[PDB]
Design a binder for this molecule. Structure first.
Ligand SMILES: [Ca+2]
Ligand SMILES: [Ca+2]
Ligand SMILES: [Ca+2]
Ligand SMILES: [Zn+2]
Lengths: 608, 270
C-alpha cells in the first residue's frame, strides 16, 4: 500500500493538479469516468457496468415478486429453489434471491381470495365472503355408498374471486391503457369487461408410476380469458385494454380442473353446474373494486367460444357430430348443405335450443319421432351451458387440410375415371402419396394430423409436387385453382383482426368462397354429391357473418387452452404432492401463477 | 465542461482528453505497457480520499473475482445440480440481469467453456511405459461405445446404442477433479505439498443393469427398455512416503449417488 503510494505519487500530483484546475476540483466523477472508459477499452463492460452500479448505488438483491416469477416461469421445485438460494447466498455473501417464506408471502397476494370486492346487487346463491380461494370442485357432491358413485377429484376457484384477482392483476396495464387513451387515472366509469370462456377435455394425462401401463385417465380444464376492457367515456366506448395474443399459452386463466372424461356427462354437469350458476348470477350485477386508490365499477359480458365441435354439440343438446344436422349455427341438413353451398344464415341460439328441447320433451303436437326430430332440428337433450354460435379456427384448418389430403389420395388414384375401388388400392394410394411427399419435401407423414403437418401440407408447392402423379391433363389446374382459392380464404378467418390485417381478402371472401363452392360442385362432384363435411359448411357459408358479428375468428378460439395442456403434465410431475387431494390444488395454484401478468412483465423486463 | 453524470461517454471523453493523454503516457512508460492497474489504483485513491473502504474493498473484490460475480464454474454447478436446461437458465440469466442491472449469472457460452475443463479430454497426461493397444492422444472425449462394432446386414445384428469414456482419460479427469482435495489431505498428513511420489490410487468399479428406463413420450406404452451403466469411483489415494503408506485421501461416503462417476452407458439387457 505504502509501496504503490510511493510508486504512483508522481501521477498523483499530476492528476490532482490537472483535474482540480480543469473541472473545479471534482476529481471524483472525473477519475470515475476515467477508469470507466479505461476499463471499457479492454472490453470489460461487465466490470464497468457493475462499477457504474456500485457507484450509482442500487438493488444488490431482488424483491420477492421477482424470485416468485423466476421459480414459476422456470419450473423449479422448492428443494431446488432453496438449493440455488443458499448456494448464491454462501458464494456471493449477499442475499440476491429471497427465502421460501418470502415467496409464499408474495404468492398469497397473486392468488384469488385476497382482495376486497363488493357485488351490487349481491350475487344470488353465491356467498359474500371475499377470501375463498381453491375449493373442492365437487361442490359438496354427496358421496356415500347410497349415491350415484362419483370418484372424480376436482378443484376450482369461485368464479367471482377469479375475476377479481384477474382484474387487480391487470390493474397496472389498464391504468396505462387509460393514460395512453388520454383519460383520467381517477376515472371510475362502468368498465365493461369482455371475457372468453373455454373448456377442453385433454386426455391421457397419466404417467406410469410403477409397472403396468394399464389405466388411461383423462382430465377437463374449464378456463377463461379477459379479452378486452372498455370504458364508456361520455357517449363512446374506448378500448382501454385488448389482449395482444388472445389464444396464447399464458393468458388463458385456469378456473376449474377435474379428472373425468369429457363425455361422462353426469359428472361433467355435476362439476360445472356451480360454475354456470355463478356466471349466470354475475350477469345482472356490477363488481365494485378499489383499484389504485379510487374504486371502480366493472360490468361483465361472457362469451363461451373455446369449445371444440364435440363439446359444443354435447353441452348444447345437439346430436353427435356425425348426424344429418351438421352446422351448429344454422339448422340445415347435410344433403341440403351440398345442394346449397353458401347462402345460409345463423339461426341457432341457446334460448332457441331450450325452447326446442321443451317442444321435444313435451311433444305438443302429437307426432312420431321421425317428424318430431324435424320439428326440433336435432335437439334431443336439455342445453346445459350457454355458448355462442361460432366456429373454432384450429380445428377448422386442421379439418380442411385433412380433407385436402383425402382429395389428394383420391386424385392420385384417378377415382373419377374408375370409381369404387377396394380397400387395398386405397392404402396403396396412401403409401404412394406418403413416399412421394417424404421424398420431395422431407414431409414425413404421421397419423394424428397436427397443426405443423397441416401448415406444411397446405402450400402451393405441395400441389405443384403432387400434380406430378396424375395421368390427367386438367386435374392439374383443377387442383391448382382449388388450392389458390383456399389460400385466398385462409387468412380471413385465421387472422386475429381481418379488418386491419387483410381487408382485401375480407371484401373478396364472398366471391372466393362462392367460386370455391362452384369448383367443388363441378370438378369434384364425385365426392361432394351428397356428404359435405361440417367445416366445409362453416368455413364457406358462415365466416363472412361471424366476422360482422364478432370481428375476428382467430381470437375467439381454443388454441389458448389446447396449449396449456403441456403445463398440466409438467406441474403434475414436477410440482405436486401425490396426495390425490393436494396434488390437484397444487397444479391449479401453480397454473394460476404461471398465467399471471404481474410476473410476465418481470420475465419480459429484458425487452423493455 | 460543466458536469459528468449527464455528460455522455464521448462528451466526457472530450472533457478529459488531456487527462487521458497524460495518464496513458505516464502509465505505459512507467509500468512497462499497462494502464489497467494504474487507473484502478488511481480511482481507488481518489475515492478513498473520502474514506470509503467499504466501496474500496468491494471494488478490490470485483477485481479479485469474488462477490456478486458467480465465476462460471459456480453457475455451472448451479445449473447442473438444479437440473435446469439451457433455455430456462437463459431465462433466469436475462431476468436477473435486466432487473438487477448487474450480471450475477454468467451467459451460456461461459458455461460451455467452463464445462470443457471438467469433462475428460482436456488435460495433457502421459503413461510410462505407454499403454499397449491404447491410443496416445489426450483429447479423447465421448467415444462411441460399440468400439467400431461391425454393423451391417451381414454380421450379428446389433442396435444397442452405447456411449463411453476412454478409461485412462476418464481416470485422469477424475484425478484432476480432486487435485485440491489431494493437496489438502497431503498437507493434513504433514507432507511436503511439493511432492510427486508414486501415488497409489485404489478404484472400485461396478456395473449394474437397471430396468425399464423407457417412458411415454406420446400416446403409447412404447416398450420395456433396459440399460446398463459401468461406473467407477476413486476409493482411496495413498502415498509411499518415508517407510510407510499414508492416506492422502479416503472417500467420505463411498457408496453415494454423487461419488460414482459414470464411465459407460449402454441400452442392453444385462
Ligand atoms: Ca376437445
Ligand atoms: Ca384438446
Ligand atoms: Ca443388478
Ligand atoms: Zn351452417
Amino acid at each position: 500500500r505504502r509501496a504503490q503510494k510511493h510508486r504512483l505519487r508522481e501521477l498523483k500530483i499530476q492528476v490532482k493538479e490537472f483535474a482540480d484546475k480543469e473541472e473545479g476540483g471534482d476529481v471524483k466523477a472525473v477519475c470515475l469516468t476515467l477508469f470507466l472508459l479505461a476499463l471499457r477499452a479492454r472490453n470489460e463492460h461487465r466490470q464497468a457496468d457493475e462499477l457504474e452500479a456500485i457507484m450509482q448505488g442500487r438493488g444488490s438483491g431482488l424483491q420477492p415478486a421477482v424470485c416468485l416469477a423466476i421459480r414459476v416461469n422456470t419450473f423449479l421445485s422448492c428443494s431446488q429453489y432453496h438449493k440455488m438460494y443458499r448456494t448464491v447466498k454462501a458464494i456471493t455473501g449477499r442475499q440476491i434471491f429471497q427465502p421460501l417464506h418470502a415467496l409464499r408471502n408474495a404468492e398469497k397476494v397473486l392468488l384469488p381470495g385476497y382482495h376486497p370486492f363488493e357485488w351490487q346487487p349481491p350475487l344470488k346463491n353465491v356467498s359474500s365472503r371475499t377470501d375463498v380461494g381453491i375449493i373442492d370442485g365437487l361442490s359438496g357432491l354427496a358421496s356415500s355408498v347410497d349415491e350415484y358413485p362419483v370418484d372424480t377429484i376436482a378443484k376450482r376457484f369461485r368464479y367471482d374471486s377469479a375475476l377479481v384477482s384477474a382484474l387487480m392483476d391487470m390493474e397496472e396495464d389498464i391504468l396505462e391503457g387509460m393514460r395512453s387513451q388520454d383519460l383520467d387515472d381517477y376515472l371510475n366509469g362502468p368498465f365493461t369487461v369482455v371475457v372468453k370462456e373455454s373448456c377442453d377435455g385433454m386426455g391421457d394425462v397419466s404417467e406410469k408410476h410403477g409397472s403396468g401401463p394399464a389405466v388411461p385417465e383423462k382430465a377437463v380444464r374449464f378456463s377463461f380469458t379477459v379479452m378486452r376492457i372498455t370504458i364508456e367515456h361520455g357517449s363512446q366506448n374506448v378500448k382501454v385494454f385488448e389482449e395482444p395474443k388472445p389464444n396464447s399459452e399464458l393468458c388463458c386463466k385456469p378456473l376449474c380442473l377435474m379428472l373425468a372424461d369429457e363425455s361422462d356427462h353426469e359428472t361433467l354437469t355435476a362439476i360445472l353446474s356451480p360454475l354456470i350458476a355463478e356466471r349466470e348470477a354475475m350477469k345482472s350485477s356490477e363488481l365494485t373494486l378499489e383499484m389504485g386508490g379510487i374504486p371502480r365499477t366493472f360490468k361483465f359480458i361472457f362469451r363461451g367460444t373455446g369449445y371444440d365441435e364435440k363439446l359444443v354439440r354435447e353441452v348444447e343438446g345437439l346430436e353427435a357430430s356425425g348426424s344429418v344436422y351438421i352446422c351448429t349455427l344454422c339448422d340445415t341438413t347435410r344433403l341440403e348443405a351440398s345442394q346449397n353451398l353458401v347462402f345460409h344464415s345463423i339461426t341457432r341460439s341457446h334460448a332457441e335450443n331450450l325452447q326446442r328441447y321443451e317442444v321435444w320433451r313435451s311433444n305438443p303436437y302429437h307426432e312420431s319421432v321421425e317428424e318430431l326430430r324435424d320439428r326440433v332440428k336435432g335437439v334431443s337433450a336439455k342445453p346445459f351451458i350457454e355458448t355462442v354460435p361460432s366456429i373454432d379456427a384450429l380445428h377448422c384448418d386442421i379439418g380442411n387440410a385433412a380433407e385436402f389430403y383425402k382429395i389428394f389420395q383420391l386424385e392420385i388414384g384417378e377415382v373419377y375415371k374408375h370409381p369404387n375401388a377396394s380397400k387395398e388400392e386405397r392404402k396403396r394410394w396412401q403409401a404412394t402419396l406418403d413416399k412421394h411427399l417424404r421424398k420431395r419435401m422431407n414431409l414425413k407423414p404421421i397419423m394424428r394430423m397436427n397443426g405443423n403437418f397441416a401448415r406444411k401440407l397446405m402450400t402451393q408447392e405441395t400441389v405443384d409436387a403432387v400434380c406430378e402423379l396424375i395421368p390427367s391433363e386438367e386435374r392439374h389446374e383443377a387442383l391448382r385453382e382449388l388450392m389458390d382459392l383456399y389460400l385466398k380464404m385462409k387468412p380471413v378467418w385465421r387472422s386475429s383482426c381481418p379488418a386491419k390485417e387483410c381487408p382485401e381478402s375480407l371484401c373478396q371472401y364472398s366471391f372466393n368462397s362462392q367460386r370455391f363452392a362452384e369448383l367443388l360442385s363441378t370438378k369434384f362432384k364425385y365426392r361432394y354429391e351428397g356428404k359435405i363435411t361440417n367445416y366445409f359448411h362453416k368455413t364457406l357459408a358462415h365466416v363472412p357473418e361471424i366476422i360482422e358479428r364478432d370481428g375476428s375468428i382467430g381470437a375467439w378460439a381454443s388454441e389458448g387452452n389446447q396449449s396449456g395442456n403441456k403445463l398440466f403434465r409438467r406441474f403434475r410431475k414436477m410440482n405436486a404432492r401425490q396426495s390425490k387431494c393436494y396434488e390437484m390444488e397444487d397444479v391449479l395454484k401453480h397454473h394460476w401463477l404461471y398465467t399471471s401478468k404481474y410476473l410476465q412483465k418481470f420475465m419480459n423486463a429484458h425487452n423493455a | 465542461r460543466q458536469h459528468l453524470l449527464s455528460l455522455t461517454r464521448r462528451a466526457q471523453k472530450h472533457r478529459l482528453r488531456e487527462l487521458k493523454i497524460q495518464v496513458k503516457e505516464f502509465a505505459d512508460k512507467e509500468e512497462g505497457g499497462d494502464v489497467k492497474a494504474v487507473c484502478l489504483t488511481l480511482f481507488l485513491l481518489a475515492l478513498r480520499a473520502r474514506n470509503e473502504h467499504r466501496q474500496a474493498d468491494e471494488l478490490e473484490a470485483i477485481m479479485q473475482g469474488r462477490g456478486s460475480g458467480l465465476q462460471p464454474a459456480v453457475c455451472l454447478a448451479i445449473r447442473v445440480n438444479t437440473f435446469l436446461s439451457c433455455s430456462q437458465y437463459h431465462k433466469m440469466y436475462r431476468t436477473v440481469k435486466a432487473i438487477t442491472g448487474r450480471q450475477i449469472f454468467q451467459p451460456l457460452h461461459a458455461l460451455r467453456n467452463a464445462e470443457k475443463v471438467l469433462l475428460p479430454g482436456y488435460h495433457p497426461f502421459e503413461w510410462q511405459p505407454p499403454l499397449k493397444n491404447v491410443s496416445s492422444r489426450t483429447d479423447v472425449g465421448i467415444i462411441d461405445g460399440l468400439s467400431g462394432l461391425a454393423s451391417s446386414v451381414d454380421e450379428y445384428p446389433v442396435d444397442t446404442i452405447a456411449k463411453r469414456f476412454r478409461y485412462d482419460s476418464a481416470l485422469v479427469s477424475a484425478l484432476m477433479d480432486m487435485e485440491e482435495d489431494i493437496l489438502e489431505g497431503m498437507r493434513s498428513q504433514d507432507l511436503d505439498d511439493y511432492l510427486n511420489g508414486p501415488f497409489t490410487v485404489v478404484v472400485k468399479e461396478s456395473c449394474d443393469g437397471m430396468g425399464d428406463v423407457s417412458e411415454k413420450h406420446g400416446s403409447g406404452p412404447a416398450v420395456p427398455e433396459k440399460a446398463v451403466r459401468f461406473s467407477f469411483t476413486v476409493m482411496r489415494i495413498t502415498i509411499e512416503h518415508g517407510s510407510q503408506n499414508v492416506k492422502v485421501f479416503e472417500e467420505p461416503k463411498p457408496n453415494s449417488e454423487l461419488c460414482c462417476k459414470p464411465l459407460c452407458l449402454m441400452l442392453a439387457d444385462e
